[PDB]
Design a protein around this motif. Structure first.
Motif, PDB file in Angstrom:
ATOM      1  N   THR A  71     -18.893  -7.225 -46.999  1.00  0.00           N
ATOM      2  CA  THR A  71     -17.617  -6.839 -47.578  1.00  0.00           C
ATOM      3  C   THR A  71     -16.885  -7.822 -47.094  1.00  0.00           C
ATOM      4  N   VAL A  72     -16.599  -8.192 -46.206  1.00  0.00           N
ATOM      5  CA  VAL A  72     -15.606  -9.542 -45.825  1.00  0.00           C
ATOM      6  C   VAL A  72     -16.041 -10.081 -46.764  1.00  0.00           C
ATOM      7  N   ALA A  73     -17.714 -10.737 -46.928  1.00  0.00           N
ATOM      8  CA  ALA A  73     -17.856 -11.557 -48.007  1.00  0.00           C
ATOM      9  C   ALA A  73     -17.666 -11.798 -48.983  1.00  0.00           C
ATOM     10  N   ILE A  74     -16.934 -10.422 -49.999  1.00  0.00           N
ATOM     11  CA  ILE A  74     -16.392 -10.596 -51.508  1.00  0.00           C
ATOM     12  C   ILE A  74     -15.563 -10.611 -51.300  1.00  0.00           C
ATOM     13  N   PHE A  75     -14.867 -10.308 -50.124  1.00  0.00           N
ATOM     14  CA  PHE A  75     -13.401 -10.434 -49.794  1.00  0.00           C
ATOM     15  C   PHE A  75     -13.269 -11.811 -50.193  1.00  0.00           C
ATOM     16  N   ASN A  76     -14.099 -12.539 -49.196  1.00  0.00           N
ATOM     17  CA  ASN A  76     -13.848 -14.242 -49.247  1.00  0.00           C
ATOM     18  C   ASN A  76     -13.902 -15.171 -50.565  1.00  0.00           C
ATOM     19  N   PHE A  77     -14.904 -14.385 -51.630  1.00  0.00           N
ATOM     20  CA  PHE A  77     -15.093 -14.802 -52.778  1.00  0.00           C
ATOM     21  C   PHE A  77     -14.479 -14.387 -53.772  1.00  0.00           C
ATOM     22  N   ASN A  78     -13.524 -13.035 -53.525  1.00  0.00           N
ATOM     23  CA  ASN A  78     -12.810 -12.917 -54.470  1.00  0.00           C
ATOM     24  C   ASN A  78     -10.866 -13.582 -53.629  1.00  0.00           C
ATOM     25  N   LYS A  79     -10.937 -14.596 -52.787  1.00  0.00           N
ATOM     26  CA  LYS A  79     -10.016 -14.738 -52.100  1.00  0.00           C
ATOM     27  C   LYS A  79      -8.721 -13.497 -51.590  1.00  0.00           C
ATOM     28  N   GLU A  80      -9.003 -12.556 -50.904  1.00  0.00           N
ATOM     29  CA  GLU A  80      -8.606 -11.637 -50.453  1.00  0.00           C
ATOM     30  C   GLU A  80      -9.278 -11.344 -49.156  1.00  0.00           C
ATOM     31  N   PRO A 138     -27.727 -10.450 -34.385  1.00  0.00           N
ATOM     32  CA  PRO A 138     -28.173 -11.551 -35.267  1.00  0.00           C
ATOM     33  C   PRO A 138     -26.857 -12.485 -36.466  1.00  0.00           C
ATOM     34  N   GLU A 139     -26.093 -13.185 -35.556  1.00  0.00           N
ATOM     35  CA  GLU A 139     -25.098 -13.726 -36.477  1.00  0.00           C
ATOM     36  C   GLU A 139     -25.137 -15.041 -37.052  1.00  0.00           C
ATOM     37  N   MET A 140     -26.345 -15.849 -36.163  1.00  0.00           N
ATOM     38  CA  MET A 140     -26.236 -17.561 -36.843  1.00  0.00           C
ATOM     39  C   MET A 140     -27.313 -17.875 -37.848  1.00  0.00           C
ATOM     40  N   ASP A 141     -27.717 -15.805 -38.167  1.00  0.00           N
ATOM     41  CA  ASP A 141     -28.911 -16.623 -39.337  1.00  0.00           C
ATOM     42  C   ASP A 141     -27.555 -15.933 -40.593  1.00  0.00           C
ATOM     43  N   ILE A 142     -27.056 -16.061 -40.194  1.00  0.00           N
ATOM     44  CA  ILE A 142     -25.721 -15.012 -41.186  1.00  0.00           C
ATOM     45  C   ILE A 142     -24.456 -16.243 -41.564  1.00  0.00           C
ATOM     46  N   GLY A 143     -24.514 -16.838 -40.805  1.00  0.00           N
ATOM     47  CA  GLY A 143     -23.219 -18.147 -40.699  1.00  0.00           C
ATOM     48  C   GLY A 143     -21.688 -17.885 -39.484  1.00  0.00           C
ATOM     49  N   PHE A 144     -22.421 -16.600 -38.656  1.00  0.00           N
ATOM     50  CA  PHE A 144     -20.842 -16.831 -38.568  1.00  0.00           C
ATOM     51  C   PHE A 144     -20.860 -16.816 -36.953  1.00  0.00           C
ATOM     52  N   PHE A 145     -20.470 -16.083 -36.300  1.00  0.00           N
ATOM     53  CA  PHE A 145     -20.252 -16.726 -35.201  1.00  0.00           C
ATOM     54  C   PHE A 145     -20.269 -14.998 -34.197  1.00  0.00           C
ATOM     55  N   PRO A 146     -21.145 -15.224 -32.311  1.00  0.00           N
ATOM     56  CA  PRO A 146     -21.050 -14.378 -31.676  1.00  0.00           C
ATOM     57  C   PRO A 146     -19.700 -13.301 -31.687  1.00  0.00           C
ATOM     58  N   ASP A 147     -19.099 -12.403 -32.196  1.00  0.00           N
ATOM     59  CA  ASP A 147     -17.682 -12.017 -31.886  1.00  0.00           C
ATOM     60  C   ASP A 147     -17.746 -10.494 -31.056  1.00  0.00           C
ATOM     61  N   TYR A 170     -29.022 -17.950 -24.714  1.00  0.00           N
ATOM     62  CA  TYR A 170     -30.257 -17.328 -25.549  1.00  0.00           C
ATOM     63  C   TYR A 170     -29.846 -16.874 -26.468  1.00  0.00           C
ATOM     64  N   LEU A 171     -29.167 -15.845 -26.408  1.00  0.00           N
ATOM     65  CA  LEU A 171     -29.510 -14.403 -26.933  1.00  0.00           C
ATOM     66  C   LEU A 171     -28.446 -14.298 -28.014  1.00  0.00           C
ATOM     67  N   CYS A 172     -27.753 -15.089 -27.835  1.00  0.00           N
ATOM     68  CA  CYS A 172     -26.299 -15.614 -28.821  1.00  0.00           C
ATOM     69  C   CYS A 172     -27.098 -16.953 -29.795  1.00  0.00           C
ATOM     70  N   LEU A 173     -27.770 -17.870 -29.806  1.00  0.00           N
ATOM     71  CA  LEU A 173     -28.033 -18.731 -30.314  1.00  0.00           C
ATOM     72  C   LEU A 173     -29.097 -18.258 -31.066  1.00  0.00           C
ATOM     73  N   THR A 174     -30.165 -17.706 -30.285  1.00  0.00           N
ATOM     74  CA  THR A 174     -31.580 -17.511 -30.561  1.00  0.00           C
ATOM     75  C   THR A 174     -31.832 -16.152 -31.595  1.00  0.00           C
ATOM     76  N   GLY A 175     -30.432 -15.137 -31.288  1.00  0.00           N
ATOM     77  CA  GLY A 175     -30.788 -13.464 -31.993  1.00  0.00           C
ATOM     78  C   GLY A 175     -31.971 -12.552 -31.630  1.00  0.00           C
TER      79      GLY A 175
END
Lengths: 217, 53
Positions: A71-80, A138-147, A170-175
């Motif tokens: 849902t956050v991705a759709i917001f970015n595509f809509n500039k929301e 699994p954030e590295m595969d979606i383009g995000f960071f370990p949040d 290892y866990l944050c970078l490899t997922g």
């Protein structure tokens, strides 16, 4: 009329918070985060609540498959962008509340605990795993960071090969997905309890109370 | 006697107006009071609910 996204119930002196988005694997949106954040502030003021229990109503399928980033991705595509920043201010503020909460919080990681789910448990000293636990970031595969404060928790709680945050990286970078007993042995889970015993444990948690003149904090 | 009849009529008319004004006030105050009662407070989060059912 619609089923509330998060359900709150009383268990004697324990307050049970149950994630109730089974079709989305209990993904966390702004609504869920805001509700939990507000209700936890009330429970902190209450003198009849001794502890809180964060579980899911979908176990053993999932506890929380992660924050609702689609849902956050759709917001970015809509500039929301205002909507997106609201989603992260609520989630991260809830992760900060759990970390600094003065009363015991007990998370039942009975199922997929990935992303936002890790934020719901990693910040509690009582994060119980089961045979069905599947911890991953699994954030590295979606383009995000370990949040969700995983960059402050993992480097401080992992047990093996984490002298210089090597295992945390290892866990944050490899997922990599960790399952059940392995999560407990790595420090991702404080306890390892069979899923079948969660009902009994929940009842015992509601029945215990601080003795004499000691507060639950 | 003329002052008595005209003061009495005025009193009766003035009393009807005062009652009408007073009743409307009471009605408005009741609506405001009720609205405050229906206002959601933060403590309401700790009251268990089954709205859907």
């Amino acid at each position: 009329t619609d089923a509330p996204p998060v359900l709150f119930t009383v268990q004697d002196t324990a307050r049970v918070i149950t994630l109730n988005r089974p079709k989305k694997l209990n993904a966390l949106n702004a609504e869920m985060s805001e509700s939990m954040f507000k209700t936890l502030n009330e429970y902190a003021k209450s003198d009849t609540t001794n502890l809180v229990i964060l579980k899911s109503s979908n176990r053993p399928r999932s506890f929380c498959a992660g924050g609702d980033v689609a849902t956050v991705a759709i917001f970015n595509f809509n500039k929301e962008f205002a909507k997106s920043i609201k989603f992260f201010t609520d989630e991260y503020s809830l992760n900060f509340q759990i970390a600094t909460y003065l009363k015991p919080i007990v998370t039942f990681m009975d199922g997929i605990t990935m992303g936002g789910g890790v934020g719901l448990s990693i910040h509690t000293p009582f994060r119980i795993a089961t045979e069905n636990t599947k911890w991953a970031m699994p954030e590295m595969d979606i383009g995000f960071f370990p949040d969700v404060g995983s960059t402050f928790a993992l480097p401080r709680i992992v047990t093996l090969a984490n002298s210089n945050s090597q295992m945390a990286l290892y866990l944050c970078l490899t997922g990599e997905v960790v399952t059940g007993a392995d999560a407990y042995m790595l420090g991702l889970a404080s306890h390892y309890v069979s899923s079948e015993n969660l009902d009994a444990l929940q009842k015992r948690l509601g029945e215990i109370s601080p003795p004499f003149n000691n507060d639950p904090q | 006697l003329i002052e008595a009849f005209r003061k009495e009529e005025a009193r009766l008319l003035h009393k009807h107006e005062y009652l009408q004004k007073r009743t409307k006030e009471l009605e408005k105050a009741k609506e405001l009071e009720l609205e405050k009662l229906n206002k959601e407070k933060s403590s309401d989060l700790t009251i268990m609910t089954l709205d859907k059912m």
